[PDB]
Write a protein that binds this ligand. Structure first.
Ligand SMILES: O[C@@H]1[C@@H](O)[C@H](O[C@@H]2CO[C@@H](O[C@@H]3CO[C@@H](O[C@@H]4CO[C@H](O)[C@H](O)[C@H]4O)[C@H](O)[C@H]3O)[C@H](O)[C@H]2O)OC[C@H]1O
Length: 324
């Protein structure tokens, strides 16, 4: 059971930015404590998995929007905005995209893969626009996810192998053409560490924006750890923000490296407080902060862990109280 009388988390940040959360469609019923926690504390929602490519077009032409729509219906019912995650990735994407349909032992051509990407993006954005219209809660999409490798080069996924480096620009062009009302993001992890990947994200967005690619924002996943350096996060935000794009913290959680002791929870609270003070300080750039999961028991990190503000019993942790 949840604590009904403690402060609604997002309300603490109303003069700064929406606070959202990634959810599973099976945790949205009124009587479910995870759904109670979701509606109480967040004013923004993201599908943890239901809007990924395999979740929306498992086989060619066979679109499966029921789970995504269940999440959108819930967001509408609770007056929450949404982020769309994600139109292109190298995981949770079906193999059929990359196969020649007459000979599945061979790869699709550059033109066929680009056409498939255009059809997927356009169908996905047109589905939400035609079904929900002005009530569509989605304000933007992660158009491409994790396109850099950890050395800062372009990740050599099947998209890069078949099409070449301009597949990124093309995804943005297709999404902008389908729905020019959506803010378009490039999303990635490790770009908060102020290392080679941060520099590479800055370089790639600088280049694509100067070429007229309609990129509106950079999504910083923020899968940080109990040992993360706040100074590196602040320097990454400043560097990426200098491009004149919005910054959203899209998938925040904290890896405890197996240490879930009471001492570690107190260290986690001090670090989360510093992190949120930094986000507030950078409110002129940051337009959303989203946690990657509702509570520790449903976090995607392997066990043992304690990554979020609500524990495995759905209770507020020391980090919740430090932030509010
Ligand atoms: O048919 C069933 C399968 O579909 C099911 O497969 C599961 C699907 O969930 C995978 O875990 C997900 C991996 O993505 C994580 O989100 C990432 C987090 O990192 C970045 O922020 C990134 O941008 C996000 O997309 C999700 O949090 C996580 O749930 C899982 O690995 C896979 O096995 O398996 C069972 C079948 O019945």
């Amino acid at each position: 059971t949840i604590q009904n009388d403690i402060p609604d988390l997002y309300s603490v940040f109303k003069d700064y930015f929406p606070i959202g959360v990634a959810v599973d469609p099976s945790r949205l019923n009124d009587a479910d404590p995870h759904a109670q926690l979701t509606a109480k504390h967040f004013n923004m929602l993201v599908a943890e998995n239901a809007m990924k490519p395999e979740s929306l077009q498992p086989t060619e032409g066979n679109f499966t929007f029921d789970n995504a729509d269940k999440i959108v219906d819930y967001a509408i019912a609770h007056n929450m905005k949404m982020r769309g995650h994600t139109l292109l990735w190298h995981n949770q994407v079906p193999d059929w995209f990359f196969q020649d349909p007459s000979d599945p032992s061979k790869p699709a051509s550059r033109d066929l893969l680009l056409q498939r990407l255009r059809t997927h993006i356009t169908t996905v954005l047109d589905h939400f626009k035609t079904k929900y219209g002005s009530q569509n809660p989605i304000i933007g999409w992660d158009v491409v996810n994790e396109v850099l490798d950890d050395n800062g080069n372009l990740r050599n996924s099947k998209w890069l192998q078949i099409i070449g480096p301009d597949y990124i620009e093309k995804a943005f062009e297709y999404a902008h053409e389908a729905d020019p009302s959506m803010k378009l993001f490039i999303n990635d992890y490790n770009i908060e560490n102020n290392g080679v990947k941060t520099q590479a994200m800055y370089d790639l967005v600088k280049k694509l924006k100067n070429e007229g690619v309609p990129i509106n924002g950079i999504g910083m996943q923020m899968h940080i750890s109990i040992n993360s350096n706040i100074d590196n996060i602040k320097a990454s935000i400043e560097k990426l923000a200098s491009l004149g794009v919005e910054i959203q913290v899209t998938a925040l959680d904290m890896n405890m490296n197996g240490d879930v002791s009471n001492d570690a929870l107190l260290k986690q609270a001090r670090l989360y407080k510093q992190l949120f003070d930094l986000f507030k300080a950078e409110k002129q750039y940051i337009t959303a902060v989203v946690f990657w999961g509702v509570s520790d028991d449903v976090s995607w990190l392997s066990k043992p862990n304690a990554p979020l503000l609500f524990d495995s019993k759905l209770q507020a942790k020391p980090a919740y109280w430090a932030i509010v």
